[PDB]
Amino acid sequence: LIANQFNSAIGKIQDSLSSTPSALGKLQDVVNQNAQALNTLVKQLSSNFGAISSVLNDILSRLDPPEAEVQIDRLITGRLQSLQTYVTQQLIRAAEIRASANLAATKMSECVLGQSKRVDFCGKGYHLMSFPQSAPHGVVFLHVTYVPAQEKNFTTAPAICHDGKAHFPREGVFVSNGTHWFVTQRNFYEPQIITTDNTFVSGNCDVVIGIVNNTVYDPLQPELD
Amino acid sequence: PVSMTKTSVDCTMYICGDSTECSNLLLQYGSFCTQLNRALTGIAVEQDKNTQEVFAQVKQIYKTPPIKDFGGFNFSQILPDPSKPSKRSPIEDLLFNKVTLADAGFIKDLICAQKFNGLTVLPPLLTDEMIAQYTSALLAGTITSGWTFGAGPALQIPFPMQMAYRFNGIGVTQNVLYENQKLIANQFNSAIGKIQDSLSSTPSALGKLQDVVNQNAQALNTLVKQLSSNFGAISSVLNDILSRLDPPEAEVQIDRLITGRLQSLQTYVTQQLIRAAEIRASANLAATKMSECVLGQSKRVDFCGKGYHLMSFPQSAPHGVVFLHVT
Amino acid sequence: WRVYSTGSNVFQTRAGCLIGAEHVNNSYECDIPIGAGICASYQTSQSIIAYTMSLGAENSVAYSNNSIAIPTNFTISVTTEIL
Ligand SMILES: *[C@@H]1O[C@H](CO)[C@@H](O[C@@H]2O[C@H](CO)[C@@H](O)[C@H](O)[C@H]2NC(C)=O)[C@H](O)[C@H]1NC(C)=O
Ligand SMILES: *[C@@H]1O[C@H](CO)[C@@H](O[C@@H]2O[C@H](CO)[C@@H](O)[C@H](O)[C@H]2NC(C)=O)[C@H](O)[C@H]1NC(C)=O
Ligand SMILES: *[C@@H]1O[C@H](CO)[C@@H](O[C@@H]2O[C@H](CO)[C@@H](O)[C@H](O)[C@H]2NC(C)=O)[C@H](O)[C@H]1NC(C)=O
Ligand SMILES: *[C@@H]1O[C@H](CO)[C@@H](O)[C@H](O)[C@H]1NC(C)=O
Ligand SMILES: *[C@@H]1O[C@H](CO)[C@@H](O)[C@H](O)[C@H]1NC(C)=O
């Protein structure tokens, strides 16, 4: 069953990436912004900045030096300001990408090389494993997780009074079909008879509120009698 | 902190305020103003992305049942109160009244003096009435289902049995809780009440939020003051230079004023970009704490309060979030 | 331009004045963000509608002081994450 569900889920990942075109926008936007910045920088070469022309050789081929100096200084001031703007914005974007790369390194170390217990760090549900794949300028994780879904209701009680002693579950919880009482682990329904080997005794049964009266089967008494 | 104030600046009303000649001089500088509007619009989008990342963790709106037999625990100081026009908890009321918020920015002072020079404040996408609804959904899911609502379908469980599970997490055997339920109930209620009174008394508690607001206002303030500087021209008023001098000599003065005002805008935009990076780092930390302290139980030491962590409750605050860690 | 300002479907939001979009009484998930809890989308004979965005489906958990819900079956789910 788990083999079939796993293979089917990988196939749905295949088809969902093969059909939806806006999936990889987190990568794509990065590329777009970089190209956009360079584009603006190139068309800052066409601005006059107050000079006679935006072409430097037309200032050179027309004017004598004592005023060609004056126009060229204005052009230099404008173009240098454009470079400083571009470099500052590139520094800030590089800081953002470095933060994203540190997060990717943390996910690679913890989701892939081990099993994580942080909630919603390695996908939705209880985490089982992860597989990395490369992407152009980025990484793609496939998180394989466990999601429990078909629930029923039962009626519980925190303890069982048997012989003036309160019995508590070693691991799990006490549930009821409606008539009997069983011990069940907390994430999958499989009822078991309440024995001495999966409960522990603690005190008498006059302190705990909501304790229900039942019997606990001892595995030794039918062996002797 | 989670988000800051979305602000938009129009160049042409700031630099060449209501002038055609100054606009024609400004067109020779290329595309600075398209760049500035792109940067500020990017920040304004990222603020809403921060708030949506932090609070919108679940996609169903749970509701607490009207009966309140939680085994002795009393959540009345964090649950929403139906007897108020905005359905908020009283701790959220104190948090709203502590912060002296400025620059409200709804449709209609010093805010008007800022407004008349091309400075605008955009409203956030999520109002304060829907952030309270996410907060109420998170508390209802936590107190009626445990941690399972953040990992699948919500499964109900009695509250002292959930709290026994949480002692079983930190290495204390669960018979400790069931034999001391009244004591734990009294300690928990008294601790919540002391949180109420301590926040009601100390005035400097919320400085982490307040400083953020202050810094933003300060930046806007000095930007407005940079309109009053001469920069070497004969006046700081553009209409006087226009009303006195002929164009071939007034162009030289107006160019100097344009250079100074454009440098002021670039300084303001650079510092806003750096502050937005700081706030985004804080919002990512808040999202991590919401996913790991609230929706589950953490085992990282001192990540979710000092001591052995049991559970946590979120509350909203103006431009921020407040966690109560029960430990 | 004045060929839109005729309107007859003007709307007043806390973000400003919206012209050219009809207001509905439903609540959907957000498509294009406008502000103050108002989003807008393109739907039905097709038009542009503006609505109050909906946070999500309402759910009520049947809490009780002696009742638990336990799963019986499970699902293996594979999700992606791009960085
Ligand atoms: C309570 O659980 C018991 C589990 O044994 C169920 O009782 C069994 O019922 C079948 C008939 O459906 C009998 O053949 C078995 O002998 C019963 N078991 C015992 C130990 O007597 C019972 O159905 C459950 N209660 C309800 C209300 O479903
Ligand atoms: C939960 O705690 C609140 C604390 O505010 C209790 O409300 C107070 O109850 C006393 C008892 O009569 C009143 O004198 C106070 O005026 C109440 N204060 C408020 C603000 O309502 C509340 O009773 C507790 N819950 C339960 C179920 O007892
Ligand atoms: C648990 O769930 C799985 C599916 O999640 C069930 O498997 C299906 O069972 C039906 C039988 O009615 C088959 O027709 C399907 O082909 C099965 N699906 C797969 C993927 O194998 C399974 O029966 C459930 N088990 C219980 C005890 O409820
Ligand atoms: C839970 O199960 C009980 C049966 O013990 C039933 O009466 C109740 O209606 C169920 N509640 C829900 C929400 O399914
Ligand atoms: C649950 O509440 C009911 C109130 O109708 C009460 O009779 C019952 O004893 C309570 N059960 C527990 C375990 O506290």
Author numbering:
A (entry chain B): 922 to 1146
B (entry chain C): 728 to 835, 848 to 1066
C (entry chain B): 633 to 676, 689 to 727
What does the literature reporting this entry say, word for word?
SARS-CoV-2 spike protein plays a key role in mediating viral entry and inducing host immune responses. It can adopt either an open or closed conformation based on the position of its receptor-binding domain (RBD). On newly packaged virus particles, the trimeric spike protein has a pre-fusion structure in which three receptor-binding S1 subunits sit on top of a trimeric membrane-fusion S2 stalk. During viral entry, a receptor-binding domain (RBD) in S1 binds to a receptor on host cell surface for viral attachment and S2 switches to a post-fusion structure for the fusion of viral and host membranes.
We identified residue 417 as potentially a key difference between the two spikes: in the closed SARS-CoV-2 trimeric spike, Lys417 in the RBD from one spike subunit forms a hydrogen bond with the main chain of Asn370 in the RBD from another spike subunit, stabilizing the RBDs in the closed conformation. To this end, we introduced the K417V mutation into SARS-CoV-2 spike ectodomain and purified both versions of the protein: K417-spike containing Lys417 and V417-spike containing Val417. To stabilize the recombinant spike ectodomain, we introduced six proline mutations into its S2 subunit to lock up its pre-fusion structure, introduced mutations to its furin motif to prevent it from being cleaved during molecular maturation, and added a C-terminal foldon tag to facilitate its trimerization. For the K417-spike, 55% of the molecules were in the closed conformation with all three RBDs down, whereas the rest of the molecules (45%) were in the open conformation with one RBD up and two RBDs down. Further 3D refinements using the good particles generated a 3.2 Å map for the closed spike and a 3.9 Å map for the open spike. Lys417 in the closed SARS-CoV-2 spike forms a hydrogen bond with another spike subunit, stabilizing the closed spike. To summarize, Lys417 in SARS-CoV-2 spike aids in keeping the spike closed, potentially hindering ACE2 binding and viral entry, but providing an edge in immune evasion. Overall, these epitope-based analyses reveal that SARS-CoV-2 spike in the closed conformation can evade significant amounts of neutralizing antibodies, confirming our previous hypothesis that the closed conformation of the spike is a viral strategy for immune evasion.
